[PDB]
């Protein structure tokens, strides 16, 4: 068992053990949830506060990398915010050096490739936070997730976290072709309430952003009253 | 500085426009560059203001004495190998180019040109200053022999019009006059009755997009007008 003490090792099975350890921080971590309208696209999730004492907005896990494209954090919020970095440095790459914005297919595969780099070397480890990533840039609405191994996929609706298996029956039962942002909204929330678990977390808030039509393809929060 | 001269049938026109300048400051926007030799012979002066004054001044002295000494009126050959001798006698001192034109009975209409070196040729349009190189290919296209004397006026007109909007050293006025058998006729057009400006052409009156606002595509629209 010598085998899982870097992630420059394979496993004699093909396996990379610290890469799968880093996923259960993912795992262990506060329930998100994501869905893609004909509009937009629509991401939410769970804060676990720590204390009754924090301002708003503390320790926020939704940020936005361009005008038109925004990114939500799961599993290590400081591992996040490096991410956050690098995503923000590939936008302004893309509008400096090419004059477009960045397209969302092209924006989840740098990030990909970024975290995949992690869990090739000996002296580093890799990331323990999953990134969903929210665009409508020339290539439409698109919603992406990128995990600790640096495998990309796209989807028409997404959860994360130690809610996930739950969450993700209650988003089969939604129409993806005919739904709109402000709906979206009230079942996604209600989605978070529910498989939030009352026992050990006692204290918690939802973060909730958007882009759309509505809002000018401009990814931002939604205003605290829309709860 | 935009002169010319060209020929119709029975006469000459030449025309300018009025600006002297130190290169980007203008000191007079009021010149006048069609300078008289004689009754019927003017000149068109580009270069030095000092050196053209000084060189048209001298041989007009020198033709009003040939034509006193044989009672009959000069010839346009006659004042344009006056002219060109001075040319080409102080050529490494001055900055000048000429353009002679008039009417005599014997041979009509003539112009002729006396560039810089103090060459000399007849021909039936002239163009000079740094406003000509504009208009080389506008006779090129438009220009034809047997005009009349009105046709020949206003070509000229639009001619020096299309030469100052684009060269930043002509502008002001355009000058013109027509000398034929009958009497000289000169004529002052205004900036504000140009035939031609770029600031009135329809296709540039709709600004270039350089400045389009911040946005989520890579569609160029408009220039951005107000402050987000």
Same mark, same amino acid.
Request: aromatic share 8%; charged share 20%.
């Given at each position: 068992?010598?085998?899982?003490?870097?992630?420059?090792?394979?496993?004699?099975?093909?396996?990379?053990?610290?890469?799968? $350890?880093?996923?259960?921080?993912?795992?262990?971590?506060?329930?998100?949830?994501?869905?893609?309208?004909?509009?937009?696209?629509?991401?939410?999730?769970?804060?676990?506060?720590? *204390?009754?004492?924090?301002?708003?907005?503390?320790?926020?896990?939704? +940020?936005?990398?361009?005008?038109?494209?925004?990114?939500?954090?799961?599993?290590?919020?400081?591992?996040?915010?490096?991410?956050? *970095?690098?995503?923000?440095?590939?936008?302004?790459?893309?509008?400096?050096?090419?004059?477009?914005?960045?397209?969302?297919?092209?924006?989840?595969?740098?990030?990909?490739?970024?975290?995949?780099? $992690?869990?090739? +070397?000996?002296? $580093?480890?890799?990331?323990?936070?999953?990134?969903?990533?929210? *665009?409508?840039?020339?290539?439409?609405?698109?919603?992406?997730?990128?995990?600790?191994?640096?495998?990309?996929?796209?989807? $028409?609706?997404?959860?994360?976290? #130690?809610?996930?298996?739950?969450?993700?029956?209650?988003?089969?039962?939604?129409?993806?072709?005919?739904?709109?942002?402000?709906?979206?909204?009230?079942?996604?929330?209600?989605?978070?309430?529910?498989? +939030?678990?009352?026992? #050990?977390?006692?204290?918690?808030?939802?973060?909730?952003?958007?882009?759309?039509?509505?809002?000018?393809?401009?990814?931002? +929060?939604?205003?605290?009253?829309?709860? | 500085?935009?002169?010319?001269? =060209? !020929?119709?049938?029975?006469? =000459?026109?030449?025309?300018?426009?009025?600006?002297?300048?130190?290169?980007?400051? =203008?000191?007079?926007?009021?010149? %006048?560059?069609?300078?008289?030799?004689?009754?019927?012979?003017?000149?068109?002066?580009?270069?030095?203001?000092?050196?053209? &004054?000084?060189? !048209?001044?001298? @041989?007009? %002295?020198?033709?009003? /004495?040939?034509?006193?000494?044989?009672?009959?009126?000069? %010839?346009?050959? @006659?004042?344009? %190998?006056?002219?060109?001798?001075?040319?080409?006698?102080?050529?490494?001192?001055?900055?000048?180019?000429?353009?002679?034109?008039?009417?005599?009975?014997?041979?009509?209409?003539?112009?002729?040109?006396?560039?810089?070196?103090?060459?000399?040729?007849?021909?039936?349009?002239?163009?000079?200053? /740094?406003?000509?190189?504009?208009?080389?290919?506008?006779?090129?296209?438009?220009?034809?022999?047997?005009?009349?004397?009105?046709?020949?006026?206003?070509?000229?007109?639009?001619?020096?019009?299309?030469?100052?909007?684009?060269?930043?050293?002509?502008?002001?006025?355009?000058?013109?006059?027509?000398?034929? &058998?009958?009497?000289?006729?000169?004529?002052?057009?205004?900036?504000?009755?140009?035939?031609?400006?770029?600031?009135?052409?329809?296709?540039?009156?709709?600004?270039?997009? &350089?400045?389009?606002?911040? /946005?989520?595509? !890579?569609?160029?629209?408009?220039? &951005?007008?107000? /402050?987000?």
């Amino acid at each position: 068992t010598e085998h899982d003490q870097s992630t420059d090792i394979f496993s004699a099975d093909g396996r990379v053990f610290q890469v799968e $350890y880093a996923c259960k921080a993912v795992d262990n971590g506060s329930t998100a949830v994501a869905a893609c309208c004909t509009d937009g696209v629509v991401v939410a999730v769970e804060k676990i506060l720590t *204390s009754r004492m924090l301002e708003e907005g503390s320790n926020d896990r939704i +940020h936005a990398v361009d005008r038109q494209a925004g990114v939500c954090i799961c599993g290590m919020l400081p591992d996040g915010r490096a991410v956050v *970095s690098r995503a923000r440095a590939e936008a302004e790459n893309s509008r400096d050096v090419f004059a477009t914005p960045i397209p969302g297919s092209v924006l989840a595969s740098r990030i990909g490739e970024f975290m995949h780099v $992690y869990t090739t +070397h000996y002296a $580093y480890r890799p990331f323990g936070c999953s990134v969903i990533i929210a *665009s409508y840039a020339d290539d439409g609405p698109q919603l992406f997730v990128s995990d600790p191994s640096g495998t990309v996929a796209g989807y $028409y609706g997404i959860a994360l976290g #130690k809610g996930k298996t739950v969450a993700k029956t209650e988003l089969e039962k939604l129409n993806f072709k005919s739904i709109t942002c402000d709906e979206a909204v009230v079942k996604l929330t209600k989605i978070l309430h529910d498989v +939030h678990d009352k026992s #050990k977390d006692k204290l918690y808030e939802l973060e909730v952003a958007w882009v759309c039509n509505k809002s000018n393809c401009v990814f931002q +929060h939604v205003p605290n009253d829309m709860i | 500085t935009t002169i010319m001269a =060209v !020929a119709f049938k029975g006469g =000459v026109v030449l025309a300018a426009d009025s600006r002297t300048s130190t290169g980007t400051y =203008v000191v007079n926007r009021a010149s %006048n560059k069609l300078t008289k030799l004689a009754e019927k012979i003017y000149c068109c002066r580009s270069g030095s203001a000092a050196d053209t &004054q000084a060189l !048209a001044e001298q @041989t007009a %002295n020198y033709l009003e /004495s040939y034509e006193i000494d044989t009672s009959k009126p000069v %010839n346009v050959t @006659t004042a344009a %190998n006056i002219f060109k001798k001075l040319c080409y006698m102080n050529k490494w001192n001055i900055s000048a180019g000429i353009i002679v034109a008039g009417y005599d009975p014997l041979n009509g209409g003539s112009v002729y040109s006396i560039p810089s070196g103090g060459s000399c040729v007849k021909l039936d349009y002239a163009l000079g200053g /740094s406003g000509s190189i504009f208009l080389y290919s506008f006779f090129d296209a438009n220009y034809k022999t047997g005009m009349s004397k009105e046709e020949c006026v206003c070509f000229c007109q639009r001619a020096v019009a299309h030469a100052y909007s684009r060269d930043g050293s002509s502008g002001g006025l355009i000058r013109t006059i027509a000398l034929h &058998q009958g009497e000289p006729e000169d004529m002052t057009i205004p900036w504000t009755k140009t035939p031609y400006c770029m600031e009135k052409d329809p296709k540039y009156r709709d600004l270039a997009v &350089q400045n389009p606002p911040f /946005s989520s595509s !890579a569609k160029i629209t408009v220039n &951005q007008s107000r /402050s987000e």
